[PDB]
Amino acid sequence: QDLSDRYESLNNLLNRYSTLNTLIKLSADPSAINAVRENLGASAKNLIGDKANSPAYQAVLLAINAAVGFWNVVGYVTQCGGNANGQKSISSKTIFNNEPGYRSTSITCSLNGHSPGYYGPMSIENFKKLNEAYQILQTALKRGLPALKENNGKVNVTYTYTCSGDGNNNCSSQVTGVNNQKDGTKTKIQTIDGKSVTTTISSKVVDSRADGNTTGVSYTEITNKLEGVPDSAQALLAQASTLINTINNACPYFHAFSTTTGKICGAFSEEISAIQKMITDAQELVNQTSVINEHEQTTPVGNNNGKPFNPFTDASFAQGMLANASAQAKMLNLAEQVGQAINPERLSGTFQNFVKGFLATCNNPSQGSAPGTVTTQTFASGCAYVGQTITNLKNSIAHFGTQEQQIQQAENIADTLVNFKSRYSELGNTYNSITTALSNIPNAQSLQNAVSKKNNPYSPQGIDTNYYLNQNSYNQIQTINQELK
Numbered sequence: 001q002d003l004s005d006r007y008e009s010l011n012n013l014l015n016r017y018s019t020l021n022t023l024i025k026l027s028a029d030p031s032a033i034n035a036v037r038e039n040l041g042a043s044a045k046n047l048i049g050d051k052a053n054s055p056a057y058q059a060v061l062l063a064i065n066a067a068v069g070f071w072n073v074v075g076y077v078t079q080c081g082g083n084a085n086g087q088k089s090i091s092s093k094t095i096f097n098n099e100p101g102y103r104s105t106s107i108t109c110s111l112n113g114h115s116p117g118y119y120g121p122m123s124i125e126n127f128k129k130l131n132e133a134y135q136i137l138q139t140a141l142k143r144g145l146p147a148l149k150e151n152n153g154k155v156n157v158t159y160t161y162t163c164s165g166d167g168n169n170n171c172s173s174q175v176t177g178v179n180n181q182k183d184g185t186k187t188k189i190q191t192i193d194g195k196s197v198t199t200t201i202s203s204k205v206v207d208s209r210a211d212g213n214t215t216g217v218s219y220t221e222i223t224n225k226l227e228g229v230p231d232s233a234q235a236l237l238a239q240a241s242t243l244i245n246t247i248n249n250a251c252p253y254f255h256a257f258s259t260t261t262g263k264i265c266g267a268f269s270e271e272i273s274a275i276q277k278m279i280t281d282a283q284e285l286v287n288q289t290s291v292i293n294e295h296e297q298t299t300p301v302g303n304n305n306g307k308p309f310n311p312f313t314d315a316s317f318a319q320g321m322l323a324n325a326s327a328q329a330k331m332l333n334l335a336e337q338v339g340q341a342i343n344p345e346r347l348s349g350t351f352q353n354f355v356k357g358f359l360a361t362c363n364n365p366s367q368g369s370a371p372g373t374v375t376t377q378t379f380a381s382g383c384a385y386v387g388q389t390i391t392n393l394k395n396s397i398a399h400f401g402t403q404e405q406q407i408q409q410a411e412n413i414a415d416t417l418v419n420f421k422s423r424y425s426e427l428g429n430t431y432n433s434i435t436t437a438l439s440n441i442p443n444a445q446s447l448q449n450a451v452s453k454k455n456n457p458y459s460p461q462g463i464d465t466n467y468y469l470n471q472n473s474y475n476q477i478q479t480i481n482q483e484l485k
């Protein structure tokens with residue numbers, strides 16, 4: 001009926017009025033503002049300092065694990081080969097160790113007679129980039145990711161690959177930088193995510209007839225040791241980004257899922273799309289960290305010398321407090337978005353099957369294997385704890401409800417303080433709208449005292465009007481409103 005709508009609208013406005021009235025009062029009381037500030041600094045600590053219990057940590061971890069896991073699933077079908085500078089080769093076998101190959105802990109790039117590129121074999125230049133990102137990630141994950149507040153942790157990373165076959169120049173001193181291919185070294189300063197890392201490149205030739213060589217051919221083995229690689233959230237998401245984008249940029253031929261021959265960037269476009277979005281949301285989330293750290297909540301507000309707190313003039317801290325609280329809300333929203341992108345309960349079709357049946361599983365034999373473990377059975381499965389990270393992310397979000405409420409409270413109070421005059425007018429304006437709604441309901445003379453107000457020229461806080469709610473009238477209004485229907 002018409003009248004139900006009038007009672008519903010009025011009940012809602014009375015709820016709003018009462019909440020705004022409370023926001024005004026909270027914003028004029030330093031002991032309440034201080035408790036909300038303290039709760040806000042404590043949630044920040046949680047988000048940025050904790051692991052298991054931080055949705056921010058779990059969302060970063062999930063973005064990283066999705067990328068590593070994607071490669072563990074599709075690597076073994078992805079074709080690679082050729083000689084340096086992305087050139088076609090005749091007989092170049094280049095093997096990368098600690099990679100999820102078909103029944104192997106290496107991937108063999110041995111596609112001869114076809115020019116590397118889009119819908120062809122991945123060039124060795126791209127595989128070298130992909131593989132370095134993958135080794136950094138797997139090494140960092142085995143050791144464990146630091147909390148979002150530790151941005152200067154470091155890891156050492158070592159990996160090896162070999163070249164064999166007549167004319168293979170992917171391990172030549174020209175390409176590696178070493179003094180002598182048979183027995184050589186080169187050290188340089190390499191930039192990774194804006195940091196300087198020391199890199200040591202070693203080269204040796206193992207002759208076909210050397211002791212311990214069961215392969216029946218001569219090969220060159222190249223060792224890359226990176227010391228001091230950054231393992232921060234930021235740096236590892238950059239590596240996850242490099243890994244996924246290098247796969248997309250190369251878009252290589254594969255040869256095996258809903259498709260069993262094609263190009264990786266096509267048959268797996270939906271998965272790539274989700275994982276890029278996860279990395280980007282996680283990076284934006286990590287960017288919110290710096291806003292949080294810049295606006296700390298440790299100092300009590302209010303004047304300490306007897307001056308009553310005046311919200312019009314004594315609230316210069318509120319802008320920082322709003323930036324902080326808004327940035328923490330933003331971190332939660334993004335973390336939730338990382339989770340939604342890959343959660344199999346929200347997916348359908350071949351994307352759901354890829355996630356449940358491949359990405360989120362591990363074929364490694366056993367408490368499962370540690371993170372960063374590659375075995376002869378990894379291929380076609382994620383082996384990156386992706387199923388359990390989805391779960392730990394959903395759970396950390398659900399158990400962060402306490403802090404989510406406190407973040408909301410701080411956003412509301414800080415917004416009020418930043419905009420005090422304007423929020424205090426809005427209270428008055430909500431009053432005025434209620435007074436009209438009241439005047440336009442039937443026979444209801446005894447409800448017209450539901451709100452009232454009084455002048456107070458003496459407020460030491462500039463709060464020259466007091467706003468009231470009559471509890472009886474409110475209750476009656478609430479009953480009447482429920483009783484339709």
Ligand SMILES: CC(=O)N[C@H]1[C@H](O[C@@H]2[C@@H](O)[C@H](O)O[C@H](CO)[C@@H]2O)O[C@H](CO)[C@@H](O[C@@H]2O[C@@H](C)[C@@H](O)[C@@H](O)[C@@H]2O)[C@@H]1O[C@@H]1O[C@H](CO)[C@H](O)[C@H](O)[C@H]1O[C@@H]1O[C@@H](C)[C@@H](O)[C@@H](O)[C@@H]1O
Pocket residue numbers: 163164165166167168169171181182205206207208216217218219220
């Ligand atoms: C090709 C090839 O691998 N040639 C290397 C050779 O053995 C081969 C045996 O694998 C196989 O059983 O027979 C084949 C003949 O059909 C091969 O020849 O082994 C020798 C000695 O161990 C390698 O030579 C040495 O290492 C090089 C870098 C150089 O210092 C030599 O002076 C040293 O003796 C030989 O490698 C090739 O050597 C030539 C010069 O003879 C060129 O340097 C060439 O670049 C080089 O091949 C390259 O290095 C290989 C070790 C291997 O990684 C290959 O893929 C790469 O292209």
